[PDB]
Amino acid sequence: TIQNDIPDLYSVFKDYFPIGVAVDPSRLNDADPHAQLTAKHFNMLVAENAMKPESLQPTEGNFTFDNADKIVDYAIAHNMKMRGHTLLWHNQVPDWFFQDPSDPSKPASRDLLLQRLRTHITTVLDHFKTKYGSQNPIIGWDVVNEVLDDNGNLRNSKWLQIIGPDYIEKAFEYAHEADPSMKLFINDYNIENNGVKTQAMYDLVKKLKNEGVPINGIGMQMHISINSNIDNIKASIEKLASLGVEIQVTALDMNMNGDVSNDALLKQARLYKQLFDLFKAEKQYITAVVFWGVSDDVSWLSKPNAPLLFDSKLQAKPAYWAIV
Ligand SMILES: O[C@@H]1[C@@H](O)[C@H](O[C@@H]2CO[C@@H](O[C@@H]3CO[C@H](O)[C@H](O)[C@H]3O)[C@H](O)[C@H]2O)OC[C@H]1O
């Protein structure tokens, strides 16, 4: 049972940016405590899995939008905005995209993979626009997800192998052409550490924007840990923001490295407070902050963990109180 009378989390940040959460379509019923926590605390929603490539086009031409639409319907019913996650990734993407259809033992050509990418992107964006029109809550999409490797080079996924380095620019071109009203993001993890990957993201976006690629923002996943350095996060935000793009914190959670003790929860509260003070200070750049999961019991991180503001019993944790 949730605490109904404590402050609605997103309301605390009304003068800064929307506060969202990634959800599962099976946790949206009015009688479900997870759905109650969702509607109470967040004014933005993201599909944790239902809008990924495999979740939308499992086999070629066979589009499965029911779960995604259930989430969109819920966002509309609760006056929430949404982020679309994600049009291209190297995980949760079906193998058929990369296979020659006449000989599945061989790879698709650059032109065929690009055509499939264009058809996927266009169908996905046209689906939400035609079904929901002006009521479409989605304000932007993670057009590409995790395209850098941890050394800062382009990740050598099948997209890169088959097409080459311009597959990123093409994804953005296709998305922009399908729906120019959507803000287009490049999303990634570890770019908040002010290391080689942060520099590579800055370099890549600088390059693509100078070439006219329609990138509107950079999504910083923010899968931080109890040991993360706030100074590095501030420096990363400032560096990426210098490109003149929006910054969104897209998948925030805190890895406790196995320590879920009361002492650790207090340390987590101090760190989350510092993190949100930083986000508020950078409000001129940050346009959304989204948590990757509603409560600890439904977090994607393996156990034991305590990554979010609501615990495994759906109760507000010390970090929630520290922030509000
Ligand atoms: O077995 C499969 C699971 O492994 C899968 O788990 C999801 C994996 O993707 C996570 O979201 C990513 C978290 O990291 C970054 O933020 C990415 O951008 C996200 O996409 C989900 O949280 C997990 O639920 O689910 C499907 C199942 O078949």
Looking at ligand 1, which residue's alpha carbon is closest to its atom 26? 49
Pocket test for ligand 1, best of 21, 93, 300 (most atoms within 8 A of CB): 300
Contact (CB, 8 A) for 172 and 185: no
- Cα(252)–Cα(273) distance, rounded to whole angstroms? 13
Structure token pair of residue 229: 């350095």
- Cα(281)–Cα(81) distance, rounded to whole angstroms? 23
Domain with 181, as residue range(s), is 1-324
Tell me if the bond preceding 304 is cis, omega within 30° of 0: yes
The residue type found at 9 is: L
Contact (CB, 8 A) for 272 and 323: yes
Full 3-state SS string of the chain: CCCCCCCCHHHHHCCCCCEEEEECHHHCCCCCHHHHHHHHHCCEEEECCCCCHHHHCCECCECCCHHHHHHHHHHHHCCCEEEEECCCCCCCCCHHHHECCCCCCCECCHHHHHHHHHHHHHHHHHHHHHHHHHHCCEEEEEEEECCECCCCCECCCHHHHHHCCCHHHHHHHHHHHHCCCCEEEEEECCCCCCCHHHHHHHHHHHHHHHCCCCCCEEEECCEEECCCCHHHHHHHHHHHHCCCCEEEEEEEEEECCCCCCHHHHHHHHHHHHHHHHHHHHCCCCEEEEEECCCCHHHCCCCCCCCCCCECCCCCECHHHHHHC
Contact (CB, 8 A) for 163 and 98: no
Ligand 1: nearest atom to the Cα of 251: 16
C-alpha 89 to ligand 1 mean position (Å): 11
C-alpha 269 to ligand 1 mean position (Å): 25
Q: Is the CB of 300 under 6 A from ligand 1?
A: yes
C-alpha 91 to ligand 1 mean position (Å): 8
- Cα(33)–Cα(115) distance, rounded to whole angstroms? 43
Contact (CB, 8 A) for 78 and 113: no
Structure token pair of residue 134: 């002006």
Q: Is the CB of 145 under 6 A from ligand 1?
A: yes
Q: Is the CB of 48 under 6 A from ligand 1?
A: yes
C-alpha 5 to ligand 1 mean position (Å): 32
Rounded (10°) angle between helices 167-178 and 196-210: 60
The residue type found at 11 is: S
Structure token pair of residue 90: 């190297």
C-alpha 92 to ligand 1 mean position (Å): 8
The residue type found at 202 is: Y
C-alpha 302 to ligand 1 mean position (Å): 12
- Cα(11)–Cα(18) distance, rounded to whole angstroms? 9
The CATH number that applies at residue 153 is 3.20.20.80
Kindly report the number of other CB atoms within 10 A of residue 305's CB atom: 20
Resolution (A): 1.4
Query: How many structural domains compose the chain?
Result: 1
Contact (CB, 8 A) for 308 and 253: yes
Q: Which residues contact 286 (CB under 8 A, 6 or more apart)?
A: 16, 17, 237, 246, 247, 248, 249, 279
Length of the chain in residues, anyone?
Answer: 324
- In the PDB record, what is the listed experimental method? X-ray
Residue corresponding to tokens 């923001």? 241
Burial class, 288, CB count within 10 angstroms (exposed 0-12 / middle 13-18 / buried 19+) = buried
- Cα(290)–Cα(301) distance, rounded to whole angstroms? 16
Q: Is the CB of 221 under 6 A from ligand 1?
A: yes
C-alpha 48 to ligand 1 mean position (Å): 7
Structure token pair of residue 240: 């990426």
- Cα(305)–Cα(109) distance, rounded to whole angstroms? 43
Structure token pair of residue 44: 């933005």
Q: Which residues contact 77 (CB under 8 A, 6 or more apart)?
A: none
- Cα(107)–Cα(264) distance, rounded to whole angstroms? 49
Ligand 1: nearest atom to the Cα of 223: 16
